[PDB]
Write an enzyme that holds these catalytic residues in place. Structure first.
Site, PDB file in Angstrom:
ATOM      1  N   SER A 129       5.364  -6.150  -0.179  1.00 45.06           N
ATOM      2  CA  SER A 129       5.865  -4.777  -0.040  1.00 45.06           C
ATOM      3  C   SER A 129       5.764  -4.287   1.404  1.00 45.06           C
ATOM      4  O   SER A 129       6.360  -4.885   2.299  1.00 45.06           O
ATOM      5  CB  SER A 129       5.161  -3.829  -1.017  1.00 45.06           C
ATOM      6  OG  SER A 129       5.556  -4.094  -2.349  1.00 45.06           O
ATOM      7  N   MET A 130       4.991  -3.231   1.634  1.00 49.32           N
ATOM      8  CA  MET A 130       4.894  -2.615   2.956  1.00 49.32           C
ATOM      9  C   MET A 130       4.478  -3.638   4.005  1.00 49.32           C
ATOM     10  O   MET A 130       4.871  -3.539   5.167  1.00 49.32           O
ATOM     11  CB  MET A 130       3.888  -1.459   2.942  1.00 49.32           C
ATOM     12  CG  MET A 130       4.218  -0.356   3.919  1.00 49.32           C
ATOM     13  SD  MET A 130       5.649   0.577   3.345  1.00 49.32           S
ATOM     14  CE  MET A 130       5.968   1.604   4.778  1.00 49.32           C
ATOM     15  N   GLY A 134       0.808  -1.218   0.000  1.00 49.98           N
ATOM     16  CA  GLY A 134       0.000   0.000   0.000  1.00 49.98           C
ATOM     17  C   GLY A 134       0.837   1.262   0.000  1.00 49.98           C
ATOM     18  O   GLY A 134       1.982   1.245  -0.456  1.00 49.98           O
ATOM     19  N   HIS A 139       9.279  -6.524  -2.577  1.00 52.24           N
ATOM     20  CA  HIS A 139       9.436  -5.730  -3.804  1.00 52.24           C
ATOM     21  C   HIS A 139       9.012  -4.279  -3.618  1.00 52.24           C
ATOM     22  O   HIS A 139       8.267  -3.961  -2.693  1.00 52.24           O
ATOM     23  CB  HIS A 139       8.669  -6.366  -4.975  1.00 52.24           C
ATOM     24  CG  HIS A 139       7.265  -5.868  -5.140  1.00 52.24           C
ATOM     25  ND1 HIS A 139       6.846  -5.180  -6.259  1.00 52.24           N
ATOM     26  CD2 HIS A 139       6.181  -5.971  -4.335  1.00 52.24           C
ATOM     27  CE1 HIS A 139       5.566  -4.876  -6.132  1.00 52.24           C
ATOM     28  NE2 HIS A 139       5.140  -5.341  -4.973  1.00 52.24           N
ATOM     29  N   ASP A 144      11.395  -8.467  -8.011  1.00 48.44           N
ATOM     30  CA  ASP A 144      10.549  -9.009  -6.940  1.00 48.44           C
ATOM     31  C   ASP A 144      11.117 -10.313  -6.371  1.00 48.44           C
ATOM     32  O   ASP A 144      11.746 -11.092  -7.096  1.00 48.44           O
ATOM     33  CB  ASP A 144       9.118  -9.242  -7.440  1.00 48.44           C
ATOM     34  CG  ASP A 144       8.456  -7.972  -7.948  1.00 48.44           C
ATOM     35  OD1 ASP A 144       7.212  -7.903  -7.916  1.00 48.44           O
ATOM     36  OD2 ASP A 144       9.170  -7.042  -8.379  1.00 48.44           O
TER      37      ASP A 144
END
Ligand SMILES: [Ca+2]
Ligand SMILES: [Ca+2]
Ligand SMILES: [Ca+2]
Ligand SMILES: [Ca+2]
Ligand SMILES: [Ca+2]
Ligand SMILES: [Ca+2]
Ligand SMILES: [Ca+2]
Lengths: 166, 162, 162, 162, 162, 165, 162, 164, 162, 163, 163, 161
Positions: free
Chosen positions: J80-81, J51, J105, J141
């Protein structure tokens, strides 16, 4: 169609946002006129707020490559990619009509790298066309400013001011 | 029409997103030109970011099949499939304009095969080894006109015309 | 106009999703060409991912009815309904371009009828068993240009123009 | 425009929904064709899922009024009003292409009265009885190309050209 | 195109819902046919469900004004304003096709005012009594081809060309 | 094109709602007919429910400026800006098809500027219809239709076009 | 096309919003007429509510640049940019039709710069003080045809073809 | 709330398409019941076409992790991730209602996509009692089990006729 | 909330298009009513045109599995799945209100399997054959509240709380 | 309300897209639990594809600030986050369930490099990885199974069963 | 309600786009907590990208008006209007969480320049910088890290850990 | 709820457009407070760009009607109708916050209504009817003190003390 008739007088129009299709349509027109007669001059009226670099560069490279001198008249405004093409016209053939405004200014690692190469390349070409130093262009292209017709001439961006048909 | 008039000197444009119907339009012209004169060269200008892979490959196959040499002048940009078709041009007749930009970029059983097959053809046209192409396509590569000649993507640069 | 001017060399283009509008536009071109010269071969380029069964079957039936042989050339891709029509062209004149790719798949009772007939019809055209068709269309089998010639889906691969 | 040239072959299309405006264009062509030559047959190709009755009835009653026999050739599908217009074709000259579907199915008192008027004409063109049609049409009636000839909706399968 | 040639046989169409722009196109056509030959009749086919009282009455008053008779032929349906303009045609030259429906059917100060005017003109054309015209305007009424002749909306049914 | 043919018969059509583009087209045809023969009359058929003031006022001013008389035949309806331009026709050459339907009481366009325009309309209309200001002002504000023969009486049109000869 | 025809009379139209492309169409027309006969006057009918400053300043600059005098008639209305271009017409040759409306009303530092240059031109053409223009452009100022002449925006009213 | 009340009957419903937020609820509910009595069985009423894999696995792991045995009960259908979580029920407490049905299917991206696909088969086979390879070609073909079949497939234990 | 204290009276409502999330609410209500007291009868009022099969089936199977009988009552309508669920109640406790509409109507292998299943479950509950349940679902059937009792669909009608 | 009841046992849920209002809700919960008991551990369950960076970093810093250790547990996926906030847990109190997917990633040019660079440092600081490993992993990634995640140093250990 | 329980600990959140109604909600809680206890501090958490002037100005003027000192804490980001309110907190009591991100790019030209000059006056005032400085630095595009926010004087100090 | 709790402090808010339904809520509040204690004042916080006239006038007349003094306070802005009500508060107790903006600016029946409000506005600000008829035509922006000198507002609220 007026645009076709004015093509018989070697006049091309560059209006609005620069993107692939209107650019391809300009490049088409330039190559056509050169084919009809490679010795006479093309007249490009620029009235664009700017647009896509990639698109506008095709127009630029056609102006240089074709044997005809392309003459750029700016009517209305020539901002950014517009300004860039206006200044790229045949030397001694770049004009502003009196009330026209010229303006300059426009994964992660691999792409930031590329915009910086492109930016440097623009500045290098634009200094070369305006006669400014590469350094002076760098300062002024960050400055989000408008030049008047007289100032564009003082800046070496165009050559003189179209004022009246003689 | 300016484009139809420009077809009387065997010039075709490939502009924008490479999509099924604009691809078909190009193939229609090339065939048409060949029919008018199967000897003289075709000149295909390329200003495209890439696009659909099957659509791109139809453009490709027509260039190889048709008798005339298809010259590929790249203006503005030839990214992804654009680059492919640019390098697909007649050997010795592929050009970048100076400030052109080129880029190497882009069911699992099929796509892996499709990729590999491009990578092969990509090597064939550039003259770089399969492995060389294989590393660059994986990790986004940009090429200016001189670099595009260096890599083997294009033959020379067009600068002016006397 | 470049599609119309190719039509007077008996070339017809089948592109994108098959559907009534595009379909009976091809059917109108075939009837047209037949009327002009009922002997000379029609040429049908096929780059579709499939479409409406009705629409396609109208092209199938039109290809058969007309006197002229309909040679079918695949470029880019020929998926499901597009593969069907590719294979349904004149036996002996069913071409591929090297880097194209063919592929097959797709009142409930009576849908199974239509399914059955298609299987049969494609076996008749490929040269294969109704069992093999029923096996290979249950699972979505992707075919390379040469593999397509091996399967009898197309006849020979057009590479260069002599 | 391909279609208006085929009008020189006395071919008229009837594709897509049967509504007022398209239906009028059919009438206009038939009425035009009669003017050119009142003897020579007209050829109404019908690929339509059906539509408005009144739109269909304009086409129907024009077919019967003009001098030329209107030969209905079916393709893809001829559902409800499509079927009706197809069965309405000149006795002896109603055809089908092998894989064409055909279908028969579908403010109150008049509804039951228009319904019956349709049925009478249905039975009178198919050779059936209005007792048989009523009972038989009521739902999901997908008669295949043969079934349609042996129901008497059309006369024969067009397979190939004379 | 097709409509501009059927205009050389003095034939005009009233298709679909009546509104100012189609109405105006019809008044242009009628005026034009008058300009060419004031003597010969005009032929106006109607398949309208109704429309704008304004738009209709412009069609009405051109019909009544221009020198030529305007023979009305009906197909499919002539409902409300279409029904009106079908009856508005030249006395004696109003026709039905066999399976064509008709439907006689449709700030108070004026709506009542113009209503009465319709009913009056309706009875003036059909030879009916103003109260039976009122009965059918107010409560809906359908009329099949022969009923329209008997009711007096139209003169006769058209069966075949001879 | 049917409308281009009827232009050789100097007939222009004012159909639908009056706005700048349709109006420019009508003006374009008036100037064009004047160009080709400045004496022969022009025949503006009007079937319009009204529209924008400045759109209509260019059609009006064109009618008055050009040498030709602009006969207005009204068919279907002429409401507000429709009615105005109908009445604006050359005097003695303004007509109504028998079942046409003339109407007045709201044109279409800062309140005192509106009242000034509204007053200018009422004045021009009075002058054309031969009525007082008084009357126009009273009756415009009243919501009712006029028949063909009522528009004749009121001085909106001159007569009823009835049958050709 | 009617606008083509009036171009033989050297009549151009400026209708609706003043915008880059419609404006390019006016510049293009003015240049064409200059080419044809640089002496004979051009006539520019204006009915616009104004628009874009760059769009209008290309129409302005051309009006001044080309040889022939651009007489300007105002019909209907000329608001903001409309008024400006109306008053930019050849001295002696600026007109209002009787019942027209003229009307004068209107990074951010350069917006004030543009507005100033604008006001200065407006004053120059109207024979008015800059500070007068500065008040009238600010508080919305409507003008009848006689008020437009008195203000010096146009020269005379154009009532009849004398 | 009707669901609240049925929660202190240790009954939870997995209904509709499986996705983060509903699955997050189902996990919150299962975490909550453990807090109450860590030994008493939870009863998960499954009725779903399927959904996201990441979503489904958050449920699956919370079932295996918490002390309580999670009993499962198919009603209507359990397709894909519904079929997966149904068979994940505590060994010997997986059920179907008699007229409920089950169904089982559904570059560096590819590598991981096949890993998941491989894992899901290994967990299926493991829970279904079938061989790893049995499941493999039986998911590629779409499979529609009846209630009695679900037992014959080793997916569930028995069918539910009536209460005791 | 009306339905809460009315559930204290052991009454549930099945109203509208029978989907999964509203079915789940009915199941919860049942299981809940059982833990309260697993012997008193629950009362289900059905006013539904029917809907999704899997939804209705979980509603179905719960009624059977839970101990207490689920006395059904038809108000308004019980069509397709609602009609089915209505007949699913305790033989001896299925009711129609005097004026109520009951109608019977409604990966292909599975659709044919599950359609078969529906029929036999409907048949077993009603006392009808498999033949008659198949017969009446294909074309329409509107059973009145009396006819439903006659059909073995429900047990008896509820005219009054007498 | 199930979530309120679970909050009584210091359990908070990170679920779905990381944005302002959902993250703000998570910080409000974390601050609340501190206000009730400054000492006892908080358990943040994570199931997020990633996000907004700004939103995630308000979660990040709240976790480090408040006295309570915030123990991260991973269910489903942490991309991610998601993976970032997962590693941000108390050194030693970070878990995956056995079938947890974890993806590493990347989600005004040089501006973002400066943000990108800082994130990498924090990542290598929480994972014990080389800065260039985090650089290379977050430019193409990178997928991690629960065991892979543990040896990457992303999380501390897998959660098999209860006690 | 978690925010309401947080309000009873004198903590307010300003999250997302600043617009009239959410700003009214903030002004509402401030007056409320002033009514609750006028001498004790209020704490405003800011995670805003900016937003409308009038809306942001009501919050500002309310902060300065109420007798309680308002302590601004920056979590996530505070850009333009957000940064303006961030720096508007009681002197001493303005904070940035370590990885928070502050920006000060530009939040009738007659009036819009007056408003802009006012904004910069107040900004300079609250920062301790010259008007001429704030005028130049708001001019173009750069984010400030938590420390750079402290050195420039946007904020008084970085929040470390719960001391 | 925050607003019900503030309502104990006889505080009411005017926020956003002034359309019929929000206006009702305000009139419904003002009536409630009067029912609770008719002597004690009501503090109406205005932050609005204006809106429907019939809505605004319902608030305006309730203010004048009810016995409690209604102290208007501007924060953010008070444009057209918002301004109208700001200056319609109890004389003496009309305030601006330091960085507030007031604006005053907005057929036969319209010109009537326009006068009626210009009269009340002039009557509330002090200065003449004609002086208002001028300034409402111009796109006016008064700052806090500018507003005070004009007499729209009585003083600037600076600090709670
Ligand atoms: Ca000049
Ligand atoms: Ca003068
Ligand atoms: Ca390193
Ligand atoms: Ca590394
Ligand atoms: Ca204070
Ligand atoms: Ca203090
Ligand atoms: Ca700086």
């Amino acid at each position: 169609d007026i645009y076709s008739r004015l093509l018989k007088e070697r006049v091309i129009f560059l209006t609005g946002q620069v993107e692939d299709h209107m650019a391809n349509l300009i490049v088409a027109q330039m190559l056509f006129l050169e084919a009809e007669n490679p010795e006479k001059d093309i007249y490009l009226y620029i009235n664009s707020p700017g647009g896509v670099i990639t698109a506008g560069m095709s127009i630029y490279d056609t102006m240089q490559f074709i044997k005809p001198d392309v003459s750029t008249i700016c009517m209305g405004q020539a901002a950014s990619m517009g300004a860039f093409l206006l200044t790229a016209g045949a030397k001694g053939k770049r004009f502003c009509l009196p009330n026209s405004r010229v303006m300059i200014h426009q994964d992660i690692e691999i792409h930031c790298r590329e915009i910086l190469k492109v930016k440097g390349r623009m500045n290098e070409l634009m200094a070369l066309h305006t006669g400014q130093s590469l350094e002076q262009i760098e300062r002024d292209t960050e400055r989000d400013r408008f030049l008047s017709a007289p100032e564009a001439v003082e800046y070496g961006l165009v050559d003189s001011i179209l004022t009246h048909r003689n």
